[PDB]
Symmetry: C5
C-alpha cells in the first residue's frame, strides 16, 4: 500500500520532470560543472607509441533549476537514481586521447530535490604520454586536460573542490606508483573561436614500482 | 488447440505485467531491495604480469524480488513462471569495482520470473581486472581479489546477500592454464568519508597457479 | 502484377507480425524442436598461452511455429519470404564455453516458409576453451564445445541433429590446421535437482598442424 | 530559386519513400540483377601464422527498380539524388570466407537515378582465408574469396560483372605487396543447406612482396 | 529570465527543425561550399610492416545554409546554439586511403550560428596508407591522404581551405615523431568518364623520428 505509494510517487516525480516538461546551457543561462578525479590505476605505459592508459572515475556535479521539486508534493522523496540518458549531461572530453574512451560503470546519475545532479563514470583512457624517466627515481610526468568540447566558458564553466586528485583508491599493486597528482582549472583560447574554453588539467607524476 | 490456449495465457500475462503499470522505478530507502549474488568460475584465461591484469570467464547468478512482478497462477492457466528478455525488466547495476576493460557478455540476456515476483538472471561474462599475478608460477600461488556491488545504490537501497561464501568451481575448465587453489565470495559493509550511508559489496578472492 | 505480389507480401507480413499477438517463446505445454548443424570452414588460431582456439563456421538452425503458417492461395502463391532475424523469435542457442563474444560474419536474415518453418544460418567466429597440446604431433589435438539453450530445458526446446557428422565440404583447403575428425553429437542428461532433461550438441574437433 | 530546387527534391523523395510500398527484395517471380565490381586499393597485411590476409577495396554495386523510377520533368528536371542507404533496399552481398566482421570505411549513402538504377559503393576492410606461401617469390601467392548474396539463390539474385578485370588503377603504389593480377568472375554453386544453386563473384588475387 | 532563454532556444530549434523539411543536401542547382582545416595533434604510430600510419587530429568543417538563418531580435538575442550532429545535415567528408574505420574522439555536437553557418569539429584517430621509409633519416618520411565527399561531385559540393598551412599549434611536444611540414591543399580531379569535376583536400605531412 505505502510502498506502492513511494513507488507510485517516485514514478510520478519522474513523469513530471521528464515526460511533461532543457536545451543545454546558454550565455544567459550558463552552467558550472564541478570536476574531480579518482585515479585507480596506470595499467600501461607504452614507450614505443607514447601512450599511457589510465583507469579512473570522474565526479561530475551540476545544478538545474528545471529539476527542482518540493518533496511535500511527492511523498517526501529527497533524491532518485535515473539513467543518464533521461537527463542532459555535460560533454566533458579529454583533449589528447588517442583512442575512444571506454566506460566501465553504469550510466546512472543521482538527482536531488534542489536540482543538483551527481554523475560518476568510471573509464579507461589512452592518452599522450611520454613515459621516459619512469624507470628512474625522478619518474615521468604527463598531463591531460578535460573540458567541454562544444561549449565555451560563457555556457559551461568548470571548477574543482580540491586541487588534489583523490589517490585513496589507487591500486596498491599497480606497476606504477603515483608520486603526485593535481587537477587544475585553466582558461584557453583556440584559433577556431573568439571565446574562452575551460578545462581542468590533470597532471600526474609516476614511476615504476620497486 | 489447448496449446494455443496456454500461449494466450502467457501472452495475456506478459502484456498485463509489462504494459499495465509504469515500470518499476528501482529501489528506494522507503522500499529497499535485497539482491543475492553467486559466482560460478569457468576459466582464468590470461594473467598479464606486464600490466597486472587478469581475465576471468564466469557466471554471475543474480536473484531478487518485486511485488509488481507477482501474479496468481489461478488467473493465468497455472503458469508459475516465464522466460523474458532482460531488457523488459529492471535489473540491478552490479558492477566490478576494479575492472580495467568493459565487461563482455558471452551469453543471452534472459531472466526467469516466478509468480512470487522473484527474478533470476545468470549472465556469463569475461572480465579484466587488477591482479598482480606475482606468485602464480610458485606452488603457493597468486592471490587477487575484486569487489562487486551496486554502482549507484547504498546499503539503504540495495542490500547484497550470498547463499554461500564458497564459489562454485564445479564447471571450472579442467584444462585451464591455471588451476584454482581457492575461490570465495564474501559480503562486506564499509562506511565512506563522504557519506554517512553504509555501502555493500561481495569481495571475490581467488588463489591460483600455473597448472603444470 | 509483380506489384501485386509485392503488395500481398507486405499484407502477409502485416497479418503475421503487426496484427497477431507476439510469440512468447516455447513452454512445457508448447515445446519446440530446434534442429542444429555446423559447417566448419576454418580453424584460424590455436593459442597455447591462453588455451583458446578460434573457429569459423556456419550454424544451420531450423524450427517451426504454427503461428508462422499461411495458405499460399490466400496470398498470391507466396510460399516463402525473407525477413530480418530480429523481426521474428529466435532460439537462444549458445556455446557453453566461449571466451569471447561471438562475432557475426553474415547477414541476420532468416527464410520463413508457408508451413511455418524457419531457416537461419549465421556465420560466426568463436573463441572457446581448448588446450591445443599435441596439435603438432601426428595424432593431433582434440577440442570440444557444447551448444544448447541457455535458459530452456529439454521440455521447452528439444535440440536435434540431422546427422552427427559435421560438414567439412567447405573447409578451407590451405588452412594452418588439418581436420582429422569433426562430430556433432546430441546428449541428453538428467540432474538430481530437476525433473527435465537437458540437451546439448557436442562439437568435437580433432585437428593438427598441416604439412 | 534554391528553395525551389530544394522543394522539388523533398517532394521527389517524399513521393518515393513516404507515399509508397517499400520493395521487399527479389522473388522467383521478380528476380533482380545486381552488378558488382571491385577496386583493390591495398593489401595491408598477410599473416602466415593464421593464414589471414587483409584487403582494402571499394565494391561497386548497381541495380534497377521500377519502384524508384520518375519523370524528371514532374520534379524540376532532377535526374538523380543522394540518399542514406537505410532509406532504400540494398542487397546482402557477403564475403563467404571472411575471418572477421567486415569493417566499413565509407558513408552509407547511395545515388539513385531517374530510370531507377541505384549505385552504392562501400569501401571495406576485409580479413579472409588466404595462405600467403610464395609471397616472397617471383611467382607470388594466390588467394580467392567469393562474394554473393547470403540468403537469395541464383533464381532470386542474378550476379554479374561488367568486366572480368578488377580495377587496379587506385592500388597503393607504395604498398608492401604488388599485384600481379586480379580477377572478378561469376560462378554458380550449390550448398547442402538448400536445393537451389547460388551465384557468387570470385575474386582471385595474385600478389607478392614489392622489391626495387 | 533564465527560464525565458531556455524557452527561447527551445522555440528557435522548434521553428528551425519542424516548420520545414530538413535540408535534403546540396544539388547541382543549390551547391554548398565546405571549408576544411586540420589541427594535427599527434602521429601516434608508423608501422613499416603494414605501411600504415596513425594520426590524431581534429578536422574543422564549415558551411552555411539559408535554412539555418534567424534574427536574434526575434529570439531573445540568441546569437548561436549548440546542437547534436544528428539533428542537422552534415557533409560526408571521408578519408580516401583509410585502412581502418575512423575512431571518433569528440562529442558529436555542432554549433549553429544565427547567419546560418555551422561549425563541426570532429576529433579523429585515422589509420591510413603510408610508407614510413626514411622516418629515421634527416630528410624524413612523407605521407599523403586525401579528404572529400564520398558521394558528391564538385557540382554539388565544393571544398575550400582558409590556408594551406596545417595548424601545428596543438602538436604533441613529446611525440615520437616531429613534424617537418604539414600542408592541406584543395585539388580538382578530371576523369575521362565524367563531365563533373571532383574536389578533395590533400593532407601532406613530412616527419621523422624525434631525437
Ligand atoms: C490448474 O490445474 C488444476 C489441476 O489440473 C486444474 O484443476 C485447474 O483447473 C487448473 N487451473 C487453471 C486456472 O487452469
Ligand atoms: C546579444 O548577445 C550578444 C552576444 O554576446 C552580445 O554581444 C550583445 O550585446 C547582446 N545584445 C544586447 C542588446 O544585449
Ligand atoms: N536457467 C537460466 C540460466 C541458466 C544458465 C546456466 O548457468 C547454464 C549453464 C549450462 C547449461 N545451461 C544453463
Ligand atoms: N566513389 C568513390 C570515389 C573515391 C575513390 C578515390 O577518390 C581515390 C582514388 C585513389 C586514391 N585515393 C582515393
Ligand atoms: C566548436 C565545435 N566543436 C569543437 C570546438 C572546440 N572545442 C575544444 C577545442 C576548441 C574547439 C568548438
Ligand atoms: C538461407 C539462409 N541463410 C543462408 C543461406 C545460404 N547462403 C550462403 C551459403 C549457402 C546457403 C540460405
Amino acid at each position: 500500500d505505502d510502498k506502492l505509494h513511494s513507488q507510485a510517487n517516485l514514478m510520478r516525480l519522474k513523469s513530471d520532470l521528464f515526460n511533461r516538461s532543457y536545451p543545454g546551457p546558454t550565455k544567459d543561462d550558463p552552467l558550472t560543472v564541478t570536476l574531480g578525479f579518482t585515479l585507480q590505476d596506470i595499467v600501461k605505459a607504452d614507450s614505443s607509441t607514447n601512450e599511457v592508459d589510465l583507469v579512473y572515475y570522474e565526479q561530475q556535479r551540476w545544478k538545474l533549476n528545471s529539476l527542482m521539486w518540493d518533496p511535500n508534493e511527492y511523498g517526501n522523496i529527497t533524491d532518485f537514481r535515473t539513467s543518464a540518458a533521461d537527463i542532459w549531461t555535460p560533454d566533458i572530453t579529454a583533449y589528447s586521447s588517442t583512442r575512444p574512451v571506454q566506460v566501465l560503470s553504469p550510466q546512472i546519475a543521482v538527482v536531488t530535490h534542489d536540482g543538483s545532479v551527481m554523475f560518476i563514470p568510471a573509464q579507461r583512457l589512452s592518452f599522450m604520454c611520454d613515459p621516459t624517466g619512469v624507470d628512474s627515481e625522478e619518474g615521468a610526468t604527463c598531463a591531460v586536460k578535460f573540458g567541454s568540447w562544444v561549449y565555451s566558458g560563457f555556457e559551461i564553466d568548470l571548477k574543482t573542490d580540491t586541487d588534489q586528485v583523490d589517490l585513496s583508491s589507487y591500486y596498491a599493486s599497480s606497476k606504477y606508483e603515483i608520486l603526485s597528482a593535481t587537477q587544475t582549472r585553466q582558461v584557453q583560447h583556440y584559433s577556431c573561436c573568439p571565446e574562452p574554453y575551460i578545462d581542468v588539467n590533470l597532471v600526474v607524476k609516476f614511476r615504476e614500482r620497486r
